[PDB]
Amino acid sequence: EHASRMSAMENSTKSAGEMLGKLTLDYNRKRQATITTELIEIIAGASALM
């Protein structure tokens, strides 16, 4: 049971590291898309007045 728990948590730490790897890539896309969205809305409002 302890050897099966040692192998069930080397598959789980692995799988929660590949899931975290896909979550930081998707957050970094949403981080970059949030700055482009905020910027485009500020440029569209400055060009409407200037």
Binding site: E41, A44, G45, A48, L49
Partner: protein
């Protein structure tokens, strides 16, 4: 081309001649039944009634939806937002509120009737003609106005149709009667207001919306008021509908209307596909009038229902281990699940409020503990169709489950046969 001023700020025909009619966003009828006859032209942008003109919201407005007459109770004069994603039951909850008023207008006097107004902004004409076919087949058209600024209409017509629809519904509020306005897709009104403002070169803000898109919606929604007894005592109840995108209620128009309205009926697309229909998220749904305007009797049984569903939600995210029995969590993991499948309801069939509070009584006092979780929707039919139908006649008149009744209907739910053994 020549442009002639008419001397008039924007008007619509209000009055009793609008009941039964399908009009556009400016008051012209589109149903092909001729001009509006018994009406007068009132303004569209009316100031909301002030602090002295109002009174407290005490009398309820029964929807017929069991998850909202119990958990999220609605009073005559409040503003209840129906917010959710696409195809999650927002129109269906609102349509059941309109259909139910026909079932309750025939059983109340003239001063207690609720006259519905459905404002359809930015939908198809196929959808609106399906609703008028539905509201005529039920009979709800003799109490309903349909204001329809569809998607082919100009963006100024979809911007003004909530206000033009409210001015028609404010006739019933201002003359001592009770109104119910449903602004379907208030999210689509703000899209029409954004378009109309970006072309007028007013500078855009967040998600290119104008700066005054809050004042677009607060000056509309604050017209739903319960007036004082000096002003006839009428009410207007608003049901704005806001559509979210992937459940993101942090979006600009959703956060505006959430902060304007009193309550919110939040519907989820994951609860919708678990069979929970109407897909009401009980944690996020609030009503800020609260149980001050609930049916008594329903209020007696909702406290047992609101508490057990609060424990059933925290026992979840531990429910994936049916090997791990505890028999105290497992007690409420099944008791809340009797309540969850109690609150399910088929659409276009609103229930009278007295038949609902008996069905919540049948699951909060444990009468339906014997039946399995998968056959409670048939058991709620077994509770209703097998008790004496005079238990509902005296619960509606007494208005609360009297001590001379909760032992009558105690033994009445024992002489029924429940589909579970």
């Amino acid at each position: 081309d020549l442009v002639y001023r008419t001397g008039q700020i924007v008007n619509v025909p209000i009055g009793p001649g609008t009941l039964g009619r399908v009009t556009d966003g400016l008051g012209q009828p589109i149903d092909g039944k001729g001009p509006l006859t018994n009406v007068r032209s009132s303004l569209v942008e009316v100031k909301a009634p002030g602090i002295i003109a109002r009174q407290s919201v005490r009398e309820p407005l029964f929807t017929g939806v069991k998850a909202v007459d119990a958990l999220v109770p609605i009073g005559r004069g409040q503003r209840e937002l129906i917010i959710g994603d696409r195809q999650t039951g927002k129109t269906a909850v609102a349509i059941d509120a309109i259909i139910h008023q026909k079932n309750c207008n025939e059983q109340v006097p003239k001063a207690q009737r609720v006259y519905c107004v459905y404002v359809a902004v930015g939908q198809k004409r196929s959808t609106v003609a399906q609703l008028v076919k539905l509201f005529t087949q039920t009979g709800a058209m003799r109490y309903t106005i349909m204001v329809s600024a569809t998607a082919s209409d100009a963006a100024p017509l979809q911007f003004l149709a909530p206000y033009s629809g409210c001015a028609m519904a404010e006739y019933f509020r201002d003359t001592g009667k009770h109104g119910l306005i449903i602004y379907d897709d208030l999210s689509k009104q703000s899209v029409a207001y954004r378009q109309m403002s970006l072309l007028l070169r007013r500078p855009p803000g967040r998600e290119a919306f104008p700066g005054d898109v809050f004042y677009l919606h607060s000056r509309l929604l604050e017209r739903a008021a319960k007036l004082s007894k000096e002003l006839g005592g009428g009410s207007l109840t608003a049901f704005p509908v806001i559509e979210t995108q992937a459940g993101d209620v942090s979006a600009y128009i959703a956060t505006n209307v959430i902060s304007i309205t009193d309550g919110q009926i939040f519907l989820e697309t994951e609860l919708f596909y678990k069979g929970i229909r109407p897909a009401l998220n009980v944690g996020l749904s609030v009503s800020r009038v609260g149980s001050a305007a609930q049916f008594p009797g329903m209020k007696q049984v909702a406290g047992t229902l609101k508490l057990e569903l609060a424990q059933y939600r925290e026992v979840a995210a531990f429910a994936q281990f049916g090997s791990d029995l505890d028999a105290a969590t497992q007690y409420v993991l099944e008791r809340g699940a009797r309540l969850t499948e109690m609150l399910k309801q088929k659409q276009f069939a609103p229930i009278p409020i007295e038949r609902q509070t008996v069905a919540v009584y049948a699951a909060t006092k444990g009468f339906l503990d014997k039946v399995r979780v998968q056959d409670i929707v048939a058991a709620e039919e077994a509770v209703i169709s097998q008790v004496n139908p005079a238990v509902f006649k005296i619960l509606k008149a007494n208005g609360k489950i009297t001590p001379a009744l909760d032992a009558h209907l105690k033994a009445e739910l024992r002489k029924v046969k429940l589909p579970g053994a």
